[PDB]
Amino acid sequence: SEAAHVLITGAAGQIGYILSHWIASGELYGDRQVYLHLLDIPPAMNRLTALTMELEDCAFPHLAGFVATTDPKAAFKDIDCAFLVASMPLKPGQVRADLISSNSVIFKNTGEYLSKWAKPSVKVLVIGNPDNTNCEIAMLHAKNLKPENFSSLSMLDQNRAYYEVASKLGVDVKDVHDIIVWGNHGESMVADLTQATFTKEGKTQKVVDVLDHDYVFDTFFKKIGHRAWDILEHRGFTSAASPTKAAIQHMKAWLFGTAPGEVLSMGIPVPEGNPYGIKPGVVFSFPCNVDKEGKIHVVEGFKVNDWLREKLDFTEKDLFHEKEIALNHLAQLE
Amino acid sequence: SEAAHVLITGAAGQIGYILSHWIASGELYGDRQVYLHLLDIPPAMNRLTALTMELEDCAFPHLAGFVATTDPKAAFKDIDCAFLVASMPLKPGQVRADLISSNSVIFKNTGEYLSKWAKPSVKVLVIGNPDNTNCEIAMLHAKNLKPENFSSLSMLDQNRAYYEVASKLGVDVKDVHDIIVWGNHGESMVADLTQATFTKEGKTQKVVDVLDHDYVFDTFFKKIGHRAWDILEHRGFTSAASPTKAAIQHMKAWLFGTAPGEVLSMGIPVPEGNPYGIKPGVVFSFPCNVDKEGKIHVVEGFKVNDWLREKLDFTEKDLFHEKEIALNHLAQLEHHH
């Protein structure tokens, strides 16, 4: 088999460091070799060199080679998949509208690089914040690609929710089922427990029937909402290993398909005729599975109660608003 | 199966951070669950809490549980294997003798903790430097354990050597064979290419019959000998992902066996019957394989030419000297009490 070419942007950063090694260890593509494309910006070149030296020093049998560069063409040329980790951070005194705007330029350019140089089959996983909107913008500016080529990462939030709920219930994570993260990141993200069940002492029950209302519809979302901050406070730096784990998990599912019964939250271009009443035109986290051909599908059969309907409508509205901010910013530049 | 209990010392550091996640992901023990004992010192506990929050946030199916602690009993109780990453760093102005000395105390204490609380079957992989001597000291002070419970990590150096030689020859690492790292770490380490073969375009040859003498017996060791320093130069911090990869690799081989034809350099208590003329009484890197029962064996049949004999003898002498320094330091402290 020919090596799979895998792009990681922001490669010199903490996520890039772990992600590149984990992929080079064989965990993503199985027996197939990987050829890493490692992109970062000019001031990061020494850290990038250091990364390459440690990759070399692992003598990884799955590593066919690597590009380590500041050059977009070399980074994007003939790639099979991409982890778009890099993004513009919020600068002091800026608000979310600024974050969306500054990143819209980056992701327009990235969409252009993808279309121009990547394989038409490239699977692009958008991680850098604001991910849903960055993904929409890249897709809109990738002329020779299609919606199937794009998704955004919501699995970190899903995994956080599963551990929180399992710990609250005093059961194993494997014994909790059908927790879903819908919509956007940020304030409007829907951490949905209304489908969720758990097993214990031979009984399967709904989480919402056992846990306190005050926990489910207040305390729980605050915990999920402040988790990253809490880690930053303790660590001195933002999360790295846990988003990396989720990123590989998402991409591996996207490459080979999901397991029987598995439901993975994934941000995708909204499918026309999805069963949950979401309007096409944004990238929206849905409960998904992936078939053996590597195609993502929204999982059918979940229920939308009044609470969930309102939450879904609110995050939908939020996504269309972010998109309008991004596109208006780009249009003003034109 | 009951979960395997795995100790990582210095767990809040970068190695512990990556190692804990890699192990929790299922890479070490396969389908079996793991329970992580994560030991560090009080000032590091907030960083350790951050680590455990990230472990939680991975929702790892293989992770049965964990304890983050500063307490030796909680850390060592009933463990199945240990990654001894923590060590005392070199202080400004110190020389290697002082590094050996400061660590002798730590590793005496650690050997005592292992003997007191770990399972009799515990596999202890010593990583923190100076690792061969730290390993010998821990073993000497682990009264209820045996030489078979202890080894030290030389696979980072082996992996460096494979990549360097493969790149020099313009082949893949899989097409190079029988590179060995013998003896101690530090200046006396023996990066041996005299056994090595490589296959290129269906032709198999000895590496030393193709590469220049100047490369093999000068340039090559200079690159391998200074590599750690060069990554610190570029990274601003010591290596982390690469020793972690080597550590998992060593422990996984030690637990479940090596593959056909596979030869892994491993620091082990010198076996009395070894075929390479090394004296018992230190921990020495040898070319090893591991059987399906998890027993390490020195690989027989390698050749010791005059060059290699001299290198082996020098690193042997070096190891006995480090041991003397460590035991003397401990003795002087006891005397002072």
mmCIF file of all heavy atoms in Angstrom, chain A residues 137-176:
data_model
loop_
_atom_site.group_PDB
_atom_site.id
_atom_site.type_symbol
_atom_site.label_atom_id
_atom_site.label_comp_id
_atom_site.label_asym_id
_atom_site.label_seq_id
_atom_site.Cartn_x
_atom_site.Cartn_y
_atom_site.Cartn_z
ATOM 1 N N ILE A 137 -16.477 27.935 6.769
ATOM 2 C CA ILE A 137 -15.751 28.878 5.935
ATOM 3 C C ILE A 137 -14.734 28.179 5.051
ATOM 4 O O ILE A 137 -14.649 28.493 3.877
ATOM 5 C CB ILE A 137 -15.064 29.952 6.789
ATOM 6 C CG1 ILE A 137 -16.101 30.849 7.458
ATOM 7 C CG2 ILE A 137 -14.109 30.801 5.949
ATOM 8 C CD1 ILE A 137 -17.053 31.562 6.492
ATOM 9 N N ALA A 138 -13.968 27.242 5.602
ATOM 10 C CA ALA A 138 -13.045 26.485 4.774
ATOM 11 C C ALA A 138 -13.782 25.754 3.645
ATOM 12 O O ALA A 138 -13.371 25.818 2.485
ATOM 13 C CB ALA A 138 -12.250 25.508 5.617
ATOM 14 N N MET A 139 -14.883 25.083 3.983
ATOM 15 C CA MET A 139 -15.656 24.353 2.989
ATOM 16 C C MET A 139 -16.175 25.277 1.887
ATOM 17 O O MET A 139 -16.089 24.950 0.692
ATOM 18 C CB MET A 139 -16.823 23.661 3.668
ATOM 19 C CG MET A 139 -17.732 22.881 2.744
ATOM 20 S SD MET A 139 -19.112 22.123 3.600
ATOM 21 C CE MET A 139 -19.898 23.562 4.297
ATOM 22 N N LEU A 140 -16.726 26.428 2.273
ATOM 23 C CA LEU A 140 -17.269 27.374 1.302
ATOM 24 C C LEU A 140 -16.218 27.901 0.344
ATOM 25 O O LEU A 140 -16.544 28.337 -0.756
ATOM 26 C CB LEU A 140 -17.930 28.564 2.002
ATOM 27 C CG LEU A 140 -19.271 28.315 2.680
ATOM 28 C CD1 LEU A 140 -19.697 29.556 3.454
ATOM 29 C CD2 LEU A 140 -20.361 27.903 1.680
ATOM 30 N N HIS A 141 -14.948 27.843 0.747
ATOM 31 C CA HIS A 141 -13.865 28.378 -0.075
ATOM 32 C C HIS A 141 -12.956 27.295 -0.654
ATOM 33 O O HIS A 141 -11.836 27.579 -1.102
ATOM 34 C CB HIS A 141 -13.075 29.415 0.729
ATOM 35 C CG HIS A 141 -13.878 30.635 1.049
ATOM 36 N ND1 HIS A 141 -14.637 30.757 2.193
ATOM 37 C CD2 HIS A 141 -14.085 31.768 0.339
ATOM 38 C CE1 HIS A 141 -15.270 31.917 2.179
ATOM 39 N NE2 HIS A 141 -14.950 32.552 1.067
ATOM 40 N N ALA A 142 -13.463 26.060 -0.659
ATOM 41 C CA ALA A 142 -12.766 24.915 -1.229
ATOM 42 C C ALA A 142 -13.528 24.464 -2.491
ATOM 43 O O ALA A 142 -14.329 23.531 -2.455
ATOM 44 C CB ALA A 142 -12.661 23.797 -0.192
ATOM 45 N N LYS A 143 -13.267 25.146 -3.605
ATOM 46 C CA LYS A 143 -14.087 25.008 -4.808
ATOM 47 C C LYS A 143 -14.197 23.580 -5.340
ATOM 48 O O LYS A 143 -15.249 23.177 -5.835
ATOM 49 C CB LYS A 143 -13.531 25.933 -5.906
ATOM 50 C CG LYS A 143 -14.058 25.680 -7.305
ATOM 51 C CD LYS A 143 -13.260 26.464 -8.328
ATOM 52 C CE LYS A 143 -13.652 26.086 -9.754
ATOM 53 N NZ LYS A 143 -14.926 26.733 -10.199
ATOM 54 N N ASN A 144 -13.108 22.827 -5.281
ATOM 55 C CA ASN A 144 -13.109 21.493 -5.873
ATOM 56 C C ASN A 144 -13.325 20.376 -4.852
ATOM 57 O O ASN A 144 -13.164 19.191 -5.158
ATOM 58 C CB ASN A 144 -11.849 21.313 -6.709
ATOM 59 C CG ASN A 144 -11.855 22.217 -7.954
ATOM 60 O OD1 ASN A 144 -12.912 22.496 -8.532
ATOM 61 N ND2 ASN A 144 -10.692 22.711 -8.326
ATOM 62 N N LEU A 145 -13.732 20.762 -3.644
ATOM 63 C CA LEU A 145 -14.117 19.793 -2.619
ATOM 64 C C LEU A 145 -15.621 19.862 -2.392
ATOM 65 O O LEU A 145 -16.317 20.694 -3.006
ATOM 66 C CB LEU A 145 -13.340 20.031 -1.319
ATOM 67 C CG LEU A 145 -11.823 19.887 -1.475
ATOM 68 C CD1 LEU A 145 -11.135 20.134 -0.151
ATOM 69 C CD2 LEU A 145 -11.442 18.533 -2.022
ATOM 70 N N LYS A 146 -16.108 18.967 -1.526
ATOM 71 C CA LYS A 146 -17.545 18.838 -1.263
ATOM 72 C C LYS A 146 -17.806 18.781 0.241
ATOM 73 O O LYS A 146 -16.867 18.616 1.033
ATOM 74 C CB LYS A 146 -18.074 17.558 -1.905
ATOM 75 C CG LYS A 146 -17.866 17.464 -3.412
ATOM 76 C CD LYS A 146 -18.335 16.113 -3.951
ATOM 77 C CE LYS A 146 -17.857 15.866 -5.372
ATOM 78 N NZ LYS A 146 -18.192 14.489 -5.850
ATOM 79 N N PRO A 147 -19.077 18.877 0.655
ATOM 80 C CA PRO A 147 -19.347 18.816 2.098
ATOM 81 C C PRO A 147 -18.822 17.543 2.784
ATOM 82 O O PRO A 147 -18.389 17.595 3.945
ATOM 83 C CB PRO A 147 -20.877 18.921 2.164
ATOM 84 C CG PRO A 147 -21.202 19.705 0.962
ATOM 85 C CD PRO A 147 -20.280 19.241 -0.109
ATOM 86 N N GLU A 148 -18.813 16.426 2.064
ATOM 87 C CA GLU A 148 -18.333 15.165 2.615
ATOM 88 C C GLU A 148 -16.875 15.216 3.047
ATOM 89 O O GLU A 148 -16.427 14.376 3.802
ATOM 90 C CB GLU A 148 -18.533 14.027 1.608
ATOM 91 C CG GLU A 148 -17.679 14.146 0.369
ATOM 92 C CD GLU A 148 -18.099 13.193 -0.726
ATOM 93 O OE1 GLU A 148 -19.208 13.367 -1.258
ATOM 94 O OE2 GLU A 148 -17.322 12.278 -1.061
ATOM 95 N N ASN A 149 -16.129 16.183 2.529
ATOM 96 C CA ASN A 149 -14.710 16.311 2.882
ATOM 97 C C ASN A 149 -14.440 16.990 4.223
ATOM 98 O O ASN A 149 -13.296 17.039 4.653
ATOM 99 C CB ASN A 149 -13.984 17.120 1.811
ATOM 100 C CG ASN A 149 -13.967 16.439 0.456
ATOM 101 O OD1 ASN A 149 -14.767 16.763 -0.415
ATOM 102 N ND2 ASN A 149 -13.018 15.531 0.258
ATOM 103 N N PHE A 150 -15.481 17.484 4.889
ATOM 104 C CA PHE A 150 -15.334 18.355 6.062
ATOM 105 C C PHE A 150 -16.115 17.899 7.292
ATOM 106 O O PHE A 150 -17.284 17.525 7.205
ATOM 107 C CB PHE A 150 -15.761 19.786 5.711
ATOM 108 C CG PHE A 150 -14.857 20.451 4.733
ATOM 109 C CD1 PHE A 150 -15.113 20.365 3.366
ATOM 110 C CD2 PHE A 150 -13.743 21.151 5.167
ATOM 111 C CE1 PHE A 150 -14.281 20.963 2.450
ATOM 112 C CE2 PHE A 150 -12.900 21.759 4.251
ATOM 113 C CZ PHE A 150 -13.171 21.666 2.891
ATOM 114 N N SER A 151 -15.473 18.010 8.448
ATOM 115 C CA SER A 151 -16.155 17.847 9.722
ATOM 116 C C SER A 151 -15.399 18.591 10.812
ATOM 117 O O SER A 151 -14.252 19.021 10.601
ATOM 118 C CB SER A 151 -16.350 16.369 10.085
ATOM 119 O OG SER A 151 -15.119 15.708 10.302
ATOM 120 N N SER A 152 -16.045 18.755 11.963
ATOM 121 C CA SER A 152 -15.441 19.432 13.107
ATOM 122 C C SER A 152 -15.525 18.560 14.356
ATOM 123 O O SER A 152 -16.367 17.663 14.448
ATOM 124 C CB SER A 152 -16.040 20.823 13.325
ATOM 125 O OG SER A 152 -17.402 20.774 13.746
ATOM 126 N N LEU A 153 -14.626 18.810 15.304
ATOM 127 C CA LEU A 153 -14.468 17.929 16.445
ATOM 128 C C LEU A 153 -15.332 18.293 17.641
ATOM 129 O O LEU A 153 -15.069 19.289 18.297
ATOM 130 C CB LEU A 153 -13.008 17.937 16.898
ATOM 131 C CG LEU A 153 -12.604 16.953 17.997
ATOM 132 C CD1 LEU A 153 -12.810 15.524 17.511
ATOM 133 C CD2 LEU A 153 -11.165 17.173 18.435
ATOM 134 N N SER A 154 -16.320 17.446 17.951
ATOM 135 C CA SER A 154 -17.112 17.586 19.173
ATOM 136 C C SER A 154 -16.914 16.408 20.143
ATOM 137 O O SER A 154 -17.479 16.416 21.236
ATOM 138 C CB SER A 154 -18.596 17.804 18.842
ATOM 139 O OG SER A 154 -19.039 16.761 18.015
ATOM 140 N N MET A 155 -16.057 15.443 19.798
ATOM 141 C CA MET A 155 -15.883 14.279 20.674
ATOM 142 C C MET A 155 -15.226 14.544 22.019
ATOM 143 O O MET A 155 -15.439 13.775 22.943
ATOM 144 C CB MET A 155 -15.158 13.147 19.961
ATOM 145 C CG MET A 155 -16.091 12.238 19.154
ATOM 146 S SD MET A 155 -17.355 11.391 20.134
ATOM 147 C CE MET A 155 -16.313 10.499 21.297
ATOM 148 N N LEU A 156 -14.428 15.600 22.143
ATOM 149 C CA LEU A 156 -13.833 15.902 23.441
ATOM 150 C C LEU A 156 -14.963 16.197 24.426
ATOM 151 O O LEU A 156 -14.934 15.727 25.568
ATOM 152 C CB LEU A 156 -12.869 17.080 23.362
ATOM 153 C CG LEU A 156 -12.321 17.598 24.693
ATOM 154 C CD1 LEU A 156 -11.604 16.480 25.462
ATOM 155 C CD2 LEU A 156 -11.403 18.803 24.438
ATOM 156 N N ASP A 157 -15.940 16.988 23.989
ATOM 157 C CA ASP A 157 -17.072 17.317 24.848
ATOM 158 C C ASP A 157 -17.917 16.083 25.173
ATOM 159 O O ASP A 157 -18.390 15.930 26.307
ATOM 160 C CB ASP A 157 -17.924 18.379 24.159
ATOM 161 C CG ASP A 157 -17.085 19.573 23.738
ATOM 162 O OD1 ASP A 157 -16.484 19.549 22.620
ATOM 163 O OD2 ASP A 157 -16.987 20.517 24.541
ATOM 164 N N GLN A 158 -18.087 15.194 24.198
ATOM 165 C CA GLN A 158 -18.823 13.961 24.427
ATOM 166 C C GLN A 158 -18.114 13.119 25.489
ATOM 167 O O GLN A 158 -18.745 12.613 26.430
ATOM 168 C CB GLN A 158 -19.004 13.134 23.146
ATOM 169 C CG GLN A 158 -19.740 11.843 23.441
ATOM 170 C CD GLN A 158 -20.141 11.077 22.217
ATOM 171 O OE1 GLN A 158 -20.789 11.621 21.320
ATOM 172 N NE2 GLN A 158 -19.797 9.800 22.181
ATOM 173 N N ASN A 159 -16.808 12.939 25.336
ATOM 174 C CA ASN A 159 -16.051 12.135 26.287
ATOM 175 C C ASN A 159 -16.088 12.739 27.688
ATOM 176 O O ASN A 159 -16.241 12.009 28.666
ATOM 177 C CB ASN A 159 -14.607 11.948 25.810
ATOM 178 C CG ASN A 159 -14.512 11.009 24.632
ATOM 179 O OD1 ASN A 159 -15.365 10.132 24.449
ATOM 180 N ND2 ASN A 159 -13.453 11.154 23.842
ATOM 181 N N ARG A 160 -15.959 14.069 27.781
ATOM 182 C CA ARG A 160 -16.091 14.756 29.065
ATOM 183 C C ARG A 160 -17.453 14.450 29.712
ATOM 184 O O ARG A 160 -17.546 14.192 30.916
ATOM 185 C CB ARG A 160 -15.957 16.261 28.876
ATOM 186 C CG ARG A 160 -14.537 16.719 28.711
ATOM 187 C CD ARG A 160 -14.498 18.207 28.472
ATOM 188 N NE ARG A 160 -13.136 18.720 28.461
ATOM 189 C CZ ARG A 160 -12.766 19.829 27.840
ATOM 190 N NH1 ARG A 160 -13.667 20.563 27.182
ATOM 191 N NH2 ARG A 160 -11.496 20.217 27.887
ATOM 192 N N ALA A 161 -18.510 14.510 28.907
ATOM 193 C CA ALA A 161 -19.844 14.285 29.438
ATOM 194 C C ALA A 161 -20.033 12.854 29.943
ATOM 195 O O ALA A 161 -20.663 12.627 30.979
ATOM 196 C CB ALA A 161 -20.871 14.618 28.366
ATOM 197 N N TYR A 162 -19.504 11.880 29.206
ATOM 198 C CA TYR A 162 -19.627 10.491 29.614
ATOM 199 C C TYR A 162 -18.933 10.237 30.948
ATOM 200 O O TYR A 162 -19.481 9.575 31.806
ATOM 201 C CB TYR A 162 -19.070 9.541 28.562
ATOM 202 C CG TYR A 162 -20.084 9.011 27.574
ATOM 203 C CD1 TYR A 162 -20.271 9.608 26.339
ATOM 204 C CD2 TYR A 162 -20.828 7.894 27.864
ATOM 205 C CE1 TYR A 162 -21.183 9.107 25.428
ATOM 206 C CE2 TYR A 162 -21.727 7.387 26.975
ATOM 207 C CZ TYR A 162 -21.903 7.997 25.752
ATOM 208 O OH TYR A 162 -22.805 7.466 24.856
ATOM 209 N N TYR A 163 -17.728 10.762 31.137
ATOM 210 C CA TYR A 163 -17.053 10.532 32.397
ATOM 211 C C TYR A 163 -17.775 11.230 33.552
ATOM 212 O O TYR A 163 -17.908 10.664 34.629
ATOM 213 C CB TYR A 163 -15.579 10.940 32.346
ATOM 214 C CG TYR A 163 -14.771 10.301 33.467
ATOM 215 C CD1 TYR A 163 -13.993 9.168 33.239
ATOM 216 C CD2 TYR A 163 -14.822 10.809 34.756
ATOM 217 C CE1 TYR A 163 -13.261 8.575 34.276
ATOM 218 C CE2 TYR A 163 -14.110 10.226 35.788
ATOM 219 C CZ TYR A 163 -13.338 9.107 35.542
ATOM 220 O OH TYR A 163 -12.626 8.538 36.570
ATOM 221 N N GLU A 164 -18.255 12.448 33.327
ATOM 222 C CA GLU A 164 -18.983 13.169 34.369
ATOM 223 C C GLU A 164 -20.231 12.411 34.806
ATOM 224 O O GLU A 164 -20.474 12.241 35.987
ATOM 225 C CB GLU A 164 -19.368 14.554 33.851
ATOM 226 C CG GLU A 164 -20.354 15.307 34.719
ATOM 227 C CD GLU A 164 -19.856 15.558 36.123
ATOM 228 O OE1 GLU A 164 -18.626 15.611 36.341
ATOM 229 O OE2 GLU A 164 -20.715 15.717 37.015
ATOM 230 N N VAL A 165 -21.029 11.973 33.843
ATOM 231 C CA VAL A 165 -22.286 11.286 34.147
ATOM 232 C C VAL A 165 -22.021 9.930 34.795
ATOM 233 O O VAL A 165 -22.666 9.567 35.777
ATOM 234 C CB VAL A 165 -23.169 11.133 32.884
ATOM 235 C CG1 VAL A 165 -24.368 10.217 33.165
ATOM 236 C CG2 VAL A 165 -23.671 12.486 32.436
ATOM 237 N N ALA A 166 -21.066 9.185 34.253
ATOM 238 C CA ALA A 166 -20.709 7.881 34.820
ATOM 239 C C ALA A 166 -20.242 8.041 36.263
ATOM 240 O O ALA A 166 -20.652 7.268 37.143
ATOM 241 C CB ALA A 166 -19.643 7.213 33.999
ATOM 242 N N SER A 167 -19.411 9.050 36.529
ATOM 243 C CA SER A 167 -18.930 9.266 37.894
ATOM 244 C C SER A 167 -20.075 9.681 38.828
ATOM 245 O O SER A 167 -20.140 9.237 39.972
ATOM 246 C CB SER A 167 -17.796 10.283 37.920
ATOM 247 O OG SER A 167 -18.254 11.579 37.607
ATOM 248 N N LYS A 168 -21.001 10.494 38.325
ATOM 249 C CA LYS A 168 -22.130 10.947 39.129
ATOM 250 C C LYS A 168 -23.007 9.764 39.536
ATOM 251 O O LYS A 168 -23.525 9.704 40.674
ATOM 252 C CB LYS A 168 -22.940 11.981 38.341
ATOM 253 C CG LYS A 168 -24.153 12.533 39.078
ATOM 254 C CD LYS A 168 -23.778 13.338 40.319
ATOM 255 C CE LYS A 168 -24.996 13.962 40.967
ATOM 256 N NZ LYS A 168 -24.632 14.890 42.071
ATOM 257 N N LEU A 169 -23.155 8.825 38.601
ATOM 258 C CA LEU A 169 -23.987 7.626 38.805
ATOM 259 C C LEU A 169 -23.274 6.489 39.548
ATOM 260 O O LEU A 169 -23.913 5.551 40.021
ATOM 261 C CB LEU A 169 -24.448 7.072 37.461
ATOM 262 C CG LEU A 169 -25.418 7.940 36.654
ATOM 263 C CD1 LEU A 169 -25.418 7.447 35.213
ATOM 264 C CD2 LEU A 169 -26.808 7.860 37.251
ATOM 265 N N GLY A 170 -21.954 6.568 39.619
ATOM 266 C CA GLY A 170 -21.149 5.539 40.245
ATOM 267 C C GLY A 170 -21.098 4.266 39.430
ATOM 268 O O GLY A 170 -21.068 3.167 39.989
ATOM 269 N N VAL A 171 -21.090 4.412 38.106
ATOM 270 C CA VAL A 171 -20.985 3.267 37.210
ATOM 271 C C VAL A 171 -19.803 3.472 36.264
ATOM 272 O O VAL A 171 -19.184 4.549 36.253
ATOM 273 C CB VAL A 171 -22.280 3.037 36.404
ATOM 274 C CG1 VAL A 171 -23.457 2.822 37.355
ATOM 275 C CG2 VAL A 171 -22.559 4.207 35.444
ATOM 276 N N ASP A 172 -19.493 2.444 35.477
ATOM 277 C CA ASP A 172 -18.429 2.547 34.484
ATOM 278 C C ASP A 172 -18.919 3.317 33.271
ATOM 279 O O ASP A 172 -20.099 3.294 32.953
ATOM 280 C CB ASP A 172 -17.966 1.156 34.029
ATOM 281 C CG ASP A 172 -17.197 0.405 35.093
ATOM 282 O OD1 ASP A 172 -16.746 1.024 36.078
ATOM 283 O OD2 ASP A 172 -17.026 -0.812 34.914
ATOM 284 N N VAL A 173 -18.001 3.947 32.550
ATOM 285 C CA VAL A 173 -18.353 4.662 31.322
ATOM 286 C C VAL A 173 -19.039 3.739 30.303
ATOM 287 O O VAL A 173 -19.967 4.151 29.617
ATOM 288 C CB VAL A 173 -17.118 5.353 30.710
ATOM 289 C CG1 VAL A 173 -17.401 5.849 29.309
ATOM 290 C CG2 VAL A 173 -16.686 6.520 31.589
ATOM 291 N N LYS A 174 -18.601 2.489 30.225
ATOM 292 C CA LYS A 174 -19.183 1.516 29.297
ATOM 293 C C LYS A 174 -20.657 1.240 29.594
ATOM 294 O O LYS A 174 -21.374 0.721 28.754
ATOM 295 C CB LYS A 174 -18.411 0.198 29.347
ATOM 296 C CG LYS A 174 -18.670 -0.585 30.629
ATOM 297 C CD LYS A 174 -17.930 -1.903 30.678
ATOM 298 C CE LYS A 174 -18.359 -2.697 31.908
ATOM 299 N NZ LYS A 174 -17.807 -4.071 31.889
ATOM 300 N N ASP A 175 -21.098 1.572 30.803
ATOM 301 C CA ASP A 175 -22.466 1.297 31.227
ATOM 302 C C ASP A 175 -23.385 2.501 31.116
ATOM 303 O O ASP A 175 -24.521 2.454 31.557
ATOM 304 C CB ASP A 175 -22.442 0.713 32.621
ATOM 305 C CG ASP A 175 -21.876 -0.689 32.620
ATOM 306 O OD1 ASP A 175 -22.204 -1.489 31.714
ATOM 307 O OD2 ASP A 175 -21.076 -0.985 33.497
ATOM 308 N N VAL A 176 -22.896 3.564 30.492
ATOM 309 C CA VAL A 176 -23.711 4.720 30.137
ATOM 310 C C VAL A 176 -23.842 4.747 28.616
ATOM 311 O O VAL A 176 -22.878 4.446 27.921
ATOM 312 C CB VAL A 176 -23.071 6.021 30.646
ATOM 313 C CG1 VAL A 176 -23.929 7.202 30.284
ATOM 314 C CG2 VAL A 176 -22.863 5.950 32.153
#
